Design an enzyme around this catalytic site. Structure first.
Site, short mmCIF file in Angstrom:
data_model
loop_
_atom_site.label_atom_id
_atom_site.label_comp_id
_atom_site.label_asym_id
_atom_site.label_seq_id
_atom_site.Cartn_x
_atom_site.Cartn_y
_atom_site.Cartn_z
N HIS A 19 7.87 0.45 4.00
CA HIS A 19 7.38 -0.77 4.60
C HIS A 19 8.57 -1.60 5.07
CE1 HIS A 19 3.17 -0.26 3.77
NE2 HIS A 19 3.42 0.00 2.50
N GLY A 20 8.32 -2.50 6.01
CA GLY A 20 9.36 -3.43 6.40
C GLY A 20 8.83 -4.57 7.23
N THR A 27 0.81 -1.21 0.00
CA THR A 27 0.00 0.00 0.00
C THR A 27 0.84 1.25 0.00
OG1 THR A 27 -0.05 0.11 2.42
CG2 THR A 27 -1.81 -1.07 1.31
N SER A 28 0.32 2.33 -0.59
CA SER A 28 1.02 3.60 -0.57
C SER A 28 1.07 4.15 0.85
CB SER A 28 0.35 4.60 -1.51
OG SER A 28 0.38 4.10 -2.83
N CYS A 39 7.69 -1.07 9.59
CA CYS A 39 7.23 -2.13 10.49
C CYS A 39 8.31 -3.16 10.75
CB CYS A 39 5.99 -2.81 9.92
SG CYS A 39 4.56 -1.72 9.99
#
Lengths: 242, 4
Positions: A93-94, A34-35, A135
């Site tokens: 993200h992660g 997701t953006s 994350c």
């Protein structure tokens, strides 16, 4: 001359150093990621914050995994002899040990390895700071109502200022930016001329832990809390002033 | 509020 102390990093080189900010907002459709609305607020806040600390800031946006690795390799091959420190900020993200390029994951160990004491010699003995908003897993925090020597380790002098605890999601507000980055910039603005960096990050921990709580129409994600985690392998105190 |  008189008695001398050396418990703090030398921060009076001609330049404070580079601040590389990797801001990944939009991801390739095929990844299904997701953006990350609000991340531009973070990137702008960090740029201004580190500009005021006299870092040479370079902002990069929407990098593929290949571009991230190439950027980090190229930066690590620069001559940092005239620079006091190095700062890298990753916004993406992660999950644990991983940061996402726009098209796939990058091993965090791979990135940081370029800057090891034996691999980036012009940064040996200098603080290398990695600030990470991403994350680290999918856990949610429900909260509770209140002789001598001649070598150094190659992993010495790194600090990872992570937005969230190991294993946990990290929270970002689509309007205000991420809880952690908002808090970090605020504390740097207020205290960089006053406090040592661990003490600044401790105040960031308190701000995130006390002032934020999620709001969601989805009960699973509602009323959740966050604590950042400082991972320090520094060997001296770090003051941004001298 | 969103997660990363």
């Amino acid at each position: 001359s008189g008695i001398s102390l050396d418990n703090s990093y030398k921060m009076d080189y001609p330049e404070m150093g580079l601040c590389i900010i990797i801001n990944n907002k939009n991801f390739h459709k095929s990844t299904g990621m997701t953006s990350r609305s609000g991340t531009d607020v973070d990137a702008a806040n960090l740029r201004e914050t580190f500009r005021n600390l006299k870092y040479e800031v370079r902002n990069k946006n929407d990098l593929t995994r290949e571009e991230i690795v190439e950027l980090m390799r190229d930066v690590s091959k620069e001559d940092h002899s005239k620079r006091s420190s190095f700062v890298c900020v990753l916004l993406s993200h992660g999950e644990e040990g991983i940061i996402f390029g726009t098209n796939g994951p990058v091993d965090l160990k791979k990135i940081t390895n370029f800057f090891r004491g034996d691999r980036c010699r012009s940064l040996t003995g200098k603080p290398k700071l990695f600030i990470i908003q991403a994350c680290r897993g999918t856990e949610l925090d429900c909260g509770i109502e209140t002789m001598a020597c001649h070598k150094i380790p190659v992993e010495a002098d790194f600090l990872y200022a992570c937005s969230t605890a190991p294993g946990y999601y990290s929270w970002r507000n689509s309007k205000d930016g991420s809880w952690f980055i908002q808090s970090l910039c605020a504390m740097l603005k207020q205290y960089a001329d006053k406090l040592e960096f661990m003490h600044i990050l401790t105040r960031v921990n308190r701000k995130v832990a006390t002032e934020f709580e999620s709001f969601s129409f989805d009960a699973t994600f509602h009323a959740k809390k966050q604590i950042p985690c400082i991972h320090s392998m520094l060997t001296k105190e770090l003051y941004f002033y001298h | 509020d969103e997660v990363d």
